[PDB]
Amino acid sequence: IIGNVFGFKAISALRLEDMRIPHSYLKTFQGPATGIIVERERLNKYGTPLLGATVKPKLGLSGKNYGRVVYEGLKGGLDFLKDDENINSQPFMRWRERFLNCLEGINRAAAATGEVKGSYLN
Amino acid sequence: SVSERTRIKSDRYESGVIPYAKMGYWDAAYSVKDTDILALFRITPQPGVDPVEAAAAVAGESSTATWTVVWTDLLTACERYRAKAYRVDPVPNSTDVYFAFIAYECDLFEEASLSNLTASIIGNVFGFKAISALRLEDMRIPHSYLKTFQGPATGIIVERERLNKYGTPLLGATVKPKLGLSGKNYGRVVYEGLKGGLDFLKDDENINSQPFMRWRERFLNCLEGINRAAAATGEVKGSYLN
Amino acid sequence: QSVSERTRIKSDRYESGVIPYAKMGYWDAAYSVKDTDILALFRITPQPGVDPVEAAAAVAGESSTATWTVVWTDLLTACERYRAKAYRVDPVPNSTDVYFAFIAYECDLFEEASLSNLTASIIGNVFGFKAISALRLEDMRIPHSYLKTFQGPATGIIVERERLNKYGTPLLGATVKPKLGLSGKNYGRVVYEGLKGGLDFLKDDENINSQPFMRWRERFLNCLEGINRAAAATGEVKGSYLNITAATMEEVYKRAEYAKAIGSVVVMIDLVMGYTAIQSIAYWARENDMLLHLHRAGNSTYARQKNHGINFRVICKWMRMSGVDHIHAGTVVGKLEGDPLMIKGFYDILRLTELEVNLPFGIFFEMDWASLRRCMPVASGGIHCGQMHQLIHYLGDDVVLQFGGGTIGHPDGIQAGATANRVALEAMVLARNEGADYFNNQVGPQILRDAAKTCGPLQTALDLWKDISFNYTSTDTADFAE
Amino acid sequence: SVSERTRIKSDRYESGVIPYAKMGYWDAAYSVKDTDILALFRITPQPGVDPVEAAAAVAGESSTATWTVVWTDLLTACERYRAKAYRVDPVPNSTDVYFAFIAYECDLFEEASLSNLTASIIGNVFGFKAISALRLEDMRIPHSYLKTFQGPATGIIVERERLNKYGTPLLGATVKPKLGLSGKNYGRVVYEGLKGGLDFLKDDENINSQPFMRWRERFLNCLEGINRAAAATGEVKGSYLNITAATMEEVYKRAEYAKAIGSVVVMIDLVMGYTAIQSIAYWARENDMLLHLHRAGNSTYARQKNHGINFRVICKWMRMSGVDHIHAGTVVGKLEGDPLMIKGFYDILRLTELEVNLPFGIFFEMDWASLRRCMPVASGGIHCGQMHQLIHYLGDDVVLQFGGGTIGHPDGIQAGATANRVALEAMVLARNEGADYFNNQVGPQILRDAAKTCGPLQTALDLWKDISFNYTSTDTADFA
Amino acid sequence: ITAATMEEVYKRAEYAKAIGSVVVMIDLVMGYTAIQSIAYWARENDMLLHLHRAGNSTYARQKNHGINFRVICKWMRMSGVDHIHAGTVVGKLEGDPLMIKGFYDILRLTELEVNLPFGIFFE
Amino acid sequence: MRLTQGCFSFLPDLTDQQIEKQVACAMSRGLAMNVEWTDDPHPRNNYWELWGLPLFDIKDPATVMFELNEARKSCAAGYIRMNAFDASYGTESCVMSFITNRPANEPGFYLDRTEGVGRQIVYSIKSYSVQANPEGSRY
Ligand SMILES: O=C(O)[C@@](O)(COP(=O)(O)O)[C@H](O)[C@H](O)COP(=O)(O)O
Ligand SMILES: O=C(O)[C@@](O)(COP(=O)(O)O)[C@H](O)[C@H](O)COP(=O)(O)O
Ligand SMILES: [Mg+2]
Ligand SMILES: [Mg+2]
Ligand SMILES: [Mg+2]
Numbered sequence A: 001i002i003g004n005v006f007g008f009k010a011i012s013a014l015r016l017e018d019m020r021i022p023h024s025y026l027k028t029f030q031g032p033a034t035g036i037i038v039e040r041e042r043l044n045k046y047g048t049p050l051l052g053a054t055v056k057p058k059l060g061l062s063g064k065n066y067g068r069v070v071y072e073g074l075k076g077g078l079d080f081l082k083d084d085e086n087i088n089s090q091p092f093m094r095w096r097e098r099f100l101n102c103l104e105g106i107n108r109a110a111a112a113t114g115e116v117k118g119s120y121l122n
Numbered sequence B: 001s002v003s004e005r006t007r008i009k010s011d012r013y014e015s016g017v018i019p020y021a022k023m024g025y026w027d028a029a030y031s032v033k034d035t036d037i038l039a040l041f042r043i044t045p046q047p048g049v050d051p052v053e054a055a056a057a058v059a060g061e062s063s064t065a066t067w068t069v070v071w072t073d074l075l076t077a078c079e080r081y082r083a084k085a086y087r088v089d090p091v092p093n094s095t096d097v098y099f100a101f102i103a104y105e106c107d108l109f110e111e112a113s114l115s116n117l118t119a120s121i122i123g124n125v126f127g128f129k130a131i132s133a134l135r136l137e138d139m140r141i142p143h144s145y146l147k148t149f150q151g152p153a154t155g156i157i158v159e160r161e162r163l164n165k166y167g168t169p170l171l172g173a174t175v176k177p178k179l180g181l182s183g184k185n186y187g188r189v190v191y192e193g194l195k196g197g198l199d200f201l202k203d204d205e206n207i208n209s210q211p212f213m214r215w216r217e218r219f220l221n222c223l224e225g226i227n228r229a230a231a232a233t234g235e236v237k238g239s240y241l242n
Numbered sequence C: 001q002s003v004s005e006r007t008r009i010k011s012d013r014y015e016s017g018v019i020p021y022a023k024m025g026y027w028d029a030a031y032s033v034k035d036t037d038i039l040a041l042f043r044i045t046p047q048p049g050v051d052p053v054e055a056a057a058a059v060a061g062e063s064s065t066a067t068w069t070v071v072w073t074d075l076l077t078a079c080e081r082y083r084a085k086a087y088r089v090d091p092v093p094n095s096t097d098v099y100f101a102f103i104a105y106e107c108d109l110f111e112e113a114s115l116s117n118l119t120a121s122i123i124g125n126v127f128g129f130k131a132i133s134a135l136r137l138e139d140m141r142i143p144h145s146y147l148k149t150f151q152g153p154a155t156g157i158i159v160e161r162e163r164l165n166k167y168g169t170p171l172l173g174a175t176v177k178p179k180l181g182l183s184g185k186n187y188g189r190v191v192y193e194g195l196k197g198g199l200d201f202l203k204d205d206e207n208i209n210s211q212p213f214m215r216w217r218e219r220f221l222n223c224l225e226g227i228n229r230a231a232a233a234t235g236e237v238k239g240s241y242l243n244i245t246a247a248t249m250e251e252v253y254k255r256a257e258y259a260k261a262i263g264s265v266v267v268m269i270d271l272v273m274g275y276t277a278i279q280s281i282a283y284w285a286r287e288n289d290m291l292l293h294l295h296r297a298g299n300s301t302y303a304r305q306k307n308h309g310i311n312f313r314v315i316c317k318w319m320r321m322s323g324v325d326h327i328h329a330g331t332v333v334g335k336l337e338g339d340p341l342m343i344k345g346f347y348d349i350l351r352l353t354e355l356e357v358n359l360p361f362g363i364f365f366e367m368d369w370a371s372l373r374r375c376m377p378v379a380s381g382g383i384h385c386g387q388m389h390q391l392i393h394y395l396g397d398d399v400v401l402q403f404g405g406g407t408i409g410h411p412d413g414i415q416a417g418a419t420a421n422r423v424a425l426e427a428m429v430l431a432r433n434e435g436a437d438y439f440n441n442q443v444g445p446q447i448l449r450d451a452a453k454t455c456g457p458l459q460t461a462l463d464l465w466k467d468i469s470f471n472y473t474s475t476d477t478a479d480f481a482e
Numbered sequence D: 001s002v003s004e005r006t007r008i009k010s011d012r013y014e015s016g017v018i019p020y021a022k023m024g025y026w027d028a029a030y031s032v033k034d035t036d037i038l039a040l041f042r043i044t045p046q047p048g049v050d051p052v053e054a055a056a057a058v059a060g061e062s063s064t065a066t067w068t069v070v071w072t073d074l075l076t077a078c079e080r081y082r083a084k085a086y087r088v089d090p091v092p093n094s095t096d097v098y099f100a101f102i103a104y105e106c107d108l109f110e111e112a113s114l115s116n117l118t119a120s121i122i123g124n125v126f127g128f129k130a131i132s133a134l135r136l137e138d139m140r141i142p143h144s145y146l147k148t149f150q151g152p153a154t155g156i157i158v159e160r161e162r163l164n165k166y167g168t169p170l171l172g173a174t175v176k177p178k179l180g181l182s183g184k185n186y187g188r189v190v191y192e193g194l195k196g197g198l199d200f201l202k203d204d205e206n207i208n209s210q211p212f213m214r215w216r217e218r219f220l221n222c223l224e225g226i227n228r229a230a231a232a233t234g235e236v237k238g239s240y241l242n243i244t245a246a247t248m249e250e251v252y253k254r255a256e257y258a259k260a261i262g263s264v265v266v267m268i269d270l271v272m273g274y275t276a277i278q279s280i281a282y283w284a285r286e287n288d289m290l291l292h293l294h295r296a297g298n299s300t301y302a303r304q305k306n307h308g309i310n311f312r313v314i315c316k317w318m319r320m321s322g323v324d325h326i327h328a329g330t331v332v333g334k335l336e337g338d339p340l341m342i343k344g345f346y347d348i349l350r351l352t353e354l355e356v357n358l359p360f361g362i363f364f365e366m367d368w369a370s371l372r373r374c375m376p377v378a379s380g381g382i383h384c385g386q387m388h389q390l391i392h393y394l395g396d397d398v399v400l401q402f403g404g405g406t407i408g409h410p411d412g413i414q415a416g417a418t419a420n421r422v423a424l425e426a427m428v429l430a431r432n433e434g435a436d437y438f439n440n441q442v443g444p445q446i447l448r449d450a451a452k453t454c455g456p457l458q459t460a461l462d463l464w465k466d467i468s469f470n471y472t473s474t475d476t477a478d479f480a
Numbered sequence E: 001i002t003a004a005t006m007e008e009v010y011k012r013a014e015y016a017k018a019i020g021s022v023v024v025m026i027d028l029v030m031g032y033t034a035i036q037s038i039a040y041w042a043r044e045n046d047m048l049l050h051l052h053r054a055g056n057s058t059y060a061r062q063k064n065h066g067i068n069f070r071v072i073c074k075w076m077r078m079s080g081v082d083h084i085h086a087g088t089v090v091g092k093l094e095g096d097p098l099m100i101k102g103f104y105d106i107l108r109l110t111e112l113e114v115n116l117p118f119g120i121f122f123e
Numbered sequence F: 001m002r003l004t005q006g007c008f009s010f011l012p013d014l015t016d017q018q019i020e021k022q023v024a025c026a027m028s029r030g031l032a033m034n035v036e037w038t039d040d041p042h043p044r045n046n047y048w049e050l051w052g053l054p055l056f057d058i059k060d061p062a063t064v065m066f067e068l069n070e071a072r073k074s075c076a077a078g079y080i081r082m083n084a085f086d087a088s089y090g091t092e093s094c095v096m097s098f099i100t101n102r103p104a105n106e107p108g109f110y111l112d113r114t115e116g117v118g119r120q121i122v123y124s125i126k127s128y129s130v131q132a133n134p135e136g137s138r139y
C-alpha cells in the first residue's frame, strides 16, 4: 500500500487517508495484547482517565535519580510514570540501573498508597 | 512550609515557562566538537514565531527540554546534555523558511542504536505546533559514533569479489507481475533471466508469503533456477530472496 | 628473460632486499598526529651502535606492517595508510643512550573492542627484537573513537557507591588470612566477623580458587551466610569478593553464575586469567548486575623495572577499557612497590574523565576518557591504620583501603581489628573535611590518637603496629620533577 | 575482658610482626617430596635485606603468610601448607644476587588450573618492596600435578601422522605485510606459498578481524587456497587461521567456523591469557584441531636476566595447558635467542623427561608424565642461507617459518617457497649421509650445490647470503 | 534416585535438589559409570551422596574367589560417594572384625600403613 | 543496636558544630545539600523522604543548619541524614551522606531464612520496628 507509489514521478503528492481492513483480514491479527478492559482490571482502576508523566529532563538523569522521580510521582498520586522516548541505555544511565531503581520506587509507592502502580520501562 | 522555603528562585530554575532560546538551547557562539552529532533542519515557523526561538525549540525538545522549567535538571550535568542550535540562515529564494544547524553531545546516544538516534532527532519535534513544517536535510555523524556501528555486512568491494564481477555495473530485474505467480513459475522467470545474462533477479517488495505462493516454494524453485543458470554460463548467479 | 625476471620490481622501495626501517616509511618527524590515531610512548634502549631513530622506526614497523626484508605484496594495499610512524624521539633526562619514542598507529589497524588485538600489535613481538637491549611501554593515547567501541567499567565508581549506599569516605576491605588452608566454614566465620566489625568487604585471596582444603561452593555458601548475618547485624549493605578465577571459561562462568544465583553483590578475578577471559566476564558483570573486582596477579613480572616491560599506568588504561570495576593500584606506604608520583598517576588514569599532560606523574599524553565509567582503585598490602593520614593524602576519596593482616592480626580478634580500621578512617576524613593539615606528621597521627582515646580497638592497633614501615628504594620512578 | 584474657601469648602466634624466616618459611633441612611443586627464583635483595629472609618472604607471600602474625593459622594444618625456602646459593659472578629454591605442597594448587598455579607463584611477590628484582627461572612440576592437565591436544607425533610428513622439519611462513591485506589477497598469498612448497602459512599475530579484512572473508578464501594447493601437490596443506578475539564467545565462534570448513589448524595469541588458552586447548582436542600458539607479549617479562619469568617456565606452563605449537626462538634470526637458552627451551618442549643441565638453564630433574610433546616453532628474520645453522641448533621436530624469507623473493612467492624447501631437504639429506654440515666449510656448500640446479634457491642465496642479526644477548646462562 | 537409565537418575536427582533435600542415595547395581556421573553431579549440586552396596556380596563373600570389599572401598572413595555401607561386625550381615576395621581405615584415613591382620597389604 | 549507614556512624553522634563544619566543607566545594528522613532503616531502603528540595542556590551554611533543625522539629521519631550532591560531569551523584539524628532505641533486624534449592538459603533482612508499626509511629 505504501511501498513505491509515493515516489511516482507522475504524481506530485500522495497521501494515504484511510483504509477499510476487512473482518477476515483482521481475524489473522492478534490485536492489543491486553486491551483497555483487561488493563483496567489489572490496575483495579475504573471511573476516571488514567494518569501518567514522563520523567524530565529528557536525558542526563542517573538510574538512582530516575527511581526517585518515579517514587515521588507515584506516591503523589500518578498511576504511571514513563521513560522518555529517547531514554534507552546511555553513558549517564545504563538500562538495568534504571529498571531496578524504578521497581524500588514503584513498590514503595504501592505500599504507601495501597494501589497498583507502574512505570513504562523503555 | 519547607516546600515554600526551598522553592528555587533563580531566573533559570524558578518554576514556570520561559523561551527555549533562554533555556540554553541557542548559542550563536557555540564551538562545534568533533564528537558532536550535527543535524541540519529546514524549519518553517508558524506566523509570528521567532525563527531563532523555533530552532532552539527543536534543539530543546530533541535533547533535554520540555515546555516548562524543571528543577531535576540540577541533578545532572545539564549544560553538557543540552543540544545547541548554533546557526540559523534563511533558505535561498524563500519567504520565512530557515536552515537551522543543531549540535548534539556524543553521550546523548546509545552506542550502535539507530532506534535511539532517531528517537531523539525525529521523535517528537515534527509534530510541534509552533512549527508548521520541518524537514531533516542532513546529519554529521562523528567518527567516534560511526565506529560503534557495523556498517555494511559485506560492502561493495567484498560483494564484487564474491561474485567475481569487476568493470561494469551489476545487472538485475524484479520478477513481474508483482503478485500472483506460483513458486514454480517464479523459478522459471529467474532461470530465464539469469541464463539470458542478468547477474540477479529479485522478489518484488510485496512478495513475501501468500496464498498464491508460500515462501519455501519460491526459495527452492529459485535455487534450481539459479544453479541451472550458473551451470549454463560459468558465472556466479543469484536472486534476492525476500 | 623469464616472465618472473621481466616483472621483478625495480624501484628503490620495493625491489627485493633489506633496507632500514627508517627508509621504509616508519619514521616521519613531520607526521601530523590524527585525533583518531592510537599513540604509544616507548622507552627504548638501543643496542650499542643502533641509531635511535632506526630503533624507533623498527618498533613502529614491526608493530604495524613491516618485516625484515621488502615484500611486494605491500603494493596490494593502501600501504602508506597502514604503516605506523615513529614521529618523535627525545633523550631520556639524566640517561646515557635511552630515548622516549612516540609512535602513531592508524585507527583502522585495530579490531573494535578487542584488547587482545590491540596488545597483539603494541606488545606482540617488538620486546624481543635483538637490536633493542631494553624496551618499556610507558603510556598510550587511546583515541575517543576507539574508546567508544569498549564497554568501560561494568558498574563504575558512581553506581558502585549507589549500590552500596556509601558516600563520603573510602571503602574498606580485608583479604582473609592465612592465604591458603582454611575451610569454607572457617572462611565464612572470618567474613562474618570482619564485616560485623565494620568492614564493607572482605575478599578471597588471589590464590584461593578451589582446592582440596576447601572447594569453592563451600566457601561461597558459607560466605553468603556470614555476609547476610553481618548485614542484619549492622543495617548496611555488605559483601565479600568471591573469587571466580578458574582454569577454563566454562568453570569461571559456573562460579560467576553461582555467585549471582545466591545474591552476591561482587565477584573477583585474577589478571593471570588473561585479557580474553577478563573482557568476557566484564560484559557478564554488566549483564548480571555484579561488581567485578580485578586482582592484578602477575602484573609485577613486567611492570616492576624502569628499563623494560609495561608500565602499570598502561595496564590501568587497558583494564578500564576492558571494564573491571576495581583494580589494585598501590598504597605508597605498604609492603609493595609504589613511588607516590607513579601511584598518583595511576589513580588519576583510573578515576578522571580526562587526562592532561603531567610528566612528573608519568602522564605523557592528553587523553579524553570518552565517558567510559570510572574504575575504583584498590589500595592493599602491608598497610595498617596508623598510616591512615598517609593513605587519605596520597589516595583520596574514591578508593578501597584493604587491611588483611591489618585486621585479622589484631590481638583482640577480627571484629576489633575491623572496628579499629573503620574508626581510624572516619576520624581522619572528618578531620580532613574540617581543614586539618592531616598529612603533617605532627597532625595526622594526633588525629588517630585522639580517636583512640575512646576506641580501645584502635588504641591497641596503634600500639601494635605504630612503628611498622616499609621504607625501601623504588624501582619504578619518575623522570621529571615537580 | 575476655578478649584480653584469651590473647595468644606464644612466640609464634602472639600478635605482631616477625621475620618470615622465623614464621616457618625457611628450612635448610627440608626434605623435598616427590609431590612438591618446586620453584627456582633469582632474587636481588634491597640493600640491607638478608638473602635468606628475602627467600623466606617469597616463600611466605606465595603460600600462606602475610606481613603480620594471624591467629587464624591455628584453624588449619598450618605447617603442611607453608612453602619452604630450602636452599639459597649466590649466583655465579655476583655478590648480591641469589638463587633460591622453594618447595610448595601439592595440595596448595587447584587441579588442572594454570591460573591457580600462577596466582600463587607469580601473583604478588614480584612487587615486594624488600626485593629490588626477582626472576622465576625454573619449576619442577611433579608427576602427580602434571597428570591433572591435558598436555598438548595433538602433540608432535599425532601432528606428523595427520600431515603425513616425517623426516624433515616442517615449513611455514607468515603472510606479509602484517596488516592491510584483503581476505581475497590473503588467500592468494596462502595459495602461492603452499603451492610453491610450504606446509603451512599463517595469519600474523595481529591479524584478527579489522576494517580492511573481516575474519570470515579470510577464512573462506584461505580454504580455497589450501585445497587448491593440496590438489596441485598431493599433500596435506593448511594455514594457521587466527581465532584470537576479544571474548571467549567470539574465539569459539571463529574456532567452530574453522572446524566447520575443514581447517587442519588454528592459531591463538598468548595475549588472550591462560584461561582462554586452556579452554581452547580442551576444545582443540575435542574437535580434532591442531592448535598453534603465538607467544605475543612474552618478551615484556621474559627478556631481562634480572627480573621477570624465564621463557623456559612459559614453555612448561604452555605444554601443560596443551598447545600443539609454540614459538621458541631461532638463535640466528631477528629476535633474541642465546643458543644455550634456546636449546634448553626446545628440550623442555620435546623430551619425555629432563635431567639437570645448568648450562642450558635446566635446574630441575623433571618427568613429563607422558604429556604429549609440544612442537617448537622457529620464526622471525631467518632465511634459507642459514639452513645448516637451523638444523644444527633446532633439530628435526620444529616448524621453520620464513615470512619475509618467502614473500620477499624477487621471482615471486612460489619461488620463495621452493627455495626454502629445496634448501631444507638438501641439508637434511646431507646430514643423514654424515656430512659435518654445521661447519662453515660444509653447510654453505651443501646449499650452493643444491642451488646449481634450483634457480629459486640460487636467487635467494644471492639476495640474503650475508644477512645476520648479531647483538649482545640479554637472557644468558650462568653456568658454562 | 536409582533408576533404569542415566536420564531418569538425573531427573530424580534434580527433583531432590529442587525441593531442598540434603541427601540422595544410589545403589551399586547401577554400576561404575553411573556412579561416577552422579558423584560429579553431587559435588556440583551441593548434595550428599549415599552409596548402598547392593550386589557387592555376590563377588565379595568368599575367600577363594572374587573381589575383597576393601578394594571396592578404594574404588568408591575414588569415584566420590560420600557414604558407603561397610559392615557392623555384630549385625545380621557378614563381617569379621579384622576385615571390617580394615575397611573403615581405608575409607577414613589420610594414608595407610601395611597392616596384614587388617588385610592392608599396601602402604 | 546502632544503625551504621552513613559515613560517620563509627564516631559519636555529631554535634551541630561538627555538622556545620561538614556542611561548610561541602558548600565550599560547590555541592548541593539536602536533608532526608525515614523510619524504615532497611539497608535497601534507597529513597528516604525528601525534606523540601535540595538547597541548590544556598551559600550560607547557617541556612542549611536552619532547615536541618526545622526538619528535626517537624519529623516523626526516626532517622535524618544529610547529603551533598555533585552535579559535575563524571559524578552526578551524592558524594557524602551521614546520619544527623537516630532514635534513642533501634531494635535492629533479624535474618529470615527460607530453604532454597540444594543447600542454598533465600535470605530476607527484616526490621523489628517496621514489622510492628506503620510509618510515623515506629519509634
Ligand atoms: O596477598 C596479599 O598480600 C594481599 O592479600 C594483601 O594482604 P595483606 O592485606 O595481609 O597485606 C593482596 O593480594 C596484595 O596487597 C596485592 O598487592 P597489590 O595490591 O599491590 O596488587
Ligand atoms: O611478526 C613477525 O615478525 C613474525 O610473523 C615473523 O615474520 P618474518 O618471518 O617475516 O620475520 C613472527 O610473528 C615473529 O617471528 C614472532 O617472533 P617469535 O617467534 O620470536 O615469537
Ligand atoms: Mg517524551
Ligand atoms: Mg518492486
Ligand atoms: Mg592476596
Ligand SMILES: [Mg+2]
Pocket (backbone or CB within 6 Å): D174, D203, D204, D205, D206
Ligand atoms: Mg608475526
